[PDB]
Amino acid sequence: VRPEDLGTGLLEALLRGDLAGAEALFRRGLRFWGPEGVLEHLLLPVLREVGEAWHRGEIGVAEEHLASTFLRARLQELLDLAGFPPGPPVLVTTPPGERHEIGAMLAAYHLRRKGVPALYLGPDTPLPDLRALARRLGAGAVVLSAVLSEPLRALPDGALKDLAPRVFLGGQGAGPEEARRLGAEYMEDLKGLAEAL
């Protein structure tokens, strides 16, 4: 199968529970596109199509869970391969109540690929606890990924100010006005995070 058909192939493999086939297809994508390219051209398009199929009522949450778990495992492999430099970390998580992790992990990965010690905490970190860890580790920045807008709507004005010296908010759930309200710097593009630091 051609590169342009790897996305359809992967989604069909996952929807029939063929994890071995899915792993093979993803690895082919990695080899063809390289790491950034496989995320852009395979991981993200499959995740989005899973979401659309769910919105259309063609699949349920269990199929989305299966696909997201698979894709998380693949991104975690890449994250581990990028390595973790010493020095003051950037803490990467999602707002309280946000359980979608891929965006955060993508942010951490893009940072790690540029030599930044992005410490992915997992999703859904209470803000007092996040601030306390940032302070204790001397973190240079906190990065939050918000896929949904509702977890941000739940936060009080200024809630993200002073989590760390720099606080960045992105994801589809976030916009510049909400970032301003919460006291974060907004960034639309993952590729601009490493530059900003």
The residues, ordered by sequence, that sit 6+ positions from 179 with a Cβ below 8 Å of its Cβ are: 160, 169, 185, 186
SS3 85: coil
The 102-131 site mask, x for binding ligand B12 (CB under 6 A), equals: xx--xx------------------------
* 87-122 core/surface letters (b: 16 or more CB in 10 A; e: else): eebbbbbbbbebebbbbbbbbbbbbbbeebbbbbbe
Q: What is the DSSP letter of 170?
A: E
What is the rounded distance in angstroms from the CA atom of residue 39 to the CA atom of residue 140?
26
Ranges within 49-68 binding a copy of itself (CB under 8 A): 60-63, 65-66, 68
Is 23 one of the binding residues for a copy of itself (CB under 8 A)? yes
For 134, the token pair is: 């940032």
147 binds a copy of itself (CB under 8 A): no
Binding residues for cob(II)alamin: 40, 48, 51-52, 55, 64, 68, 97-102, 145, 149, 171-172
Q: Which residues bind a copy of itself (CB under 8 A)?
A: 2-4, 15-17, 19-20, 23-24, 26-28, 30-37, 41, 60-63, 65-66, 68-69, 72-73, 76-78, 80-87, 89, 91, 93, 99, 112-117, 119-126, 128-130, 132-134, 136-137, 194
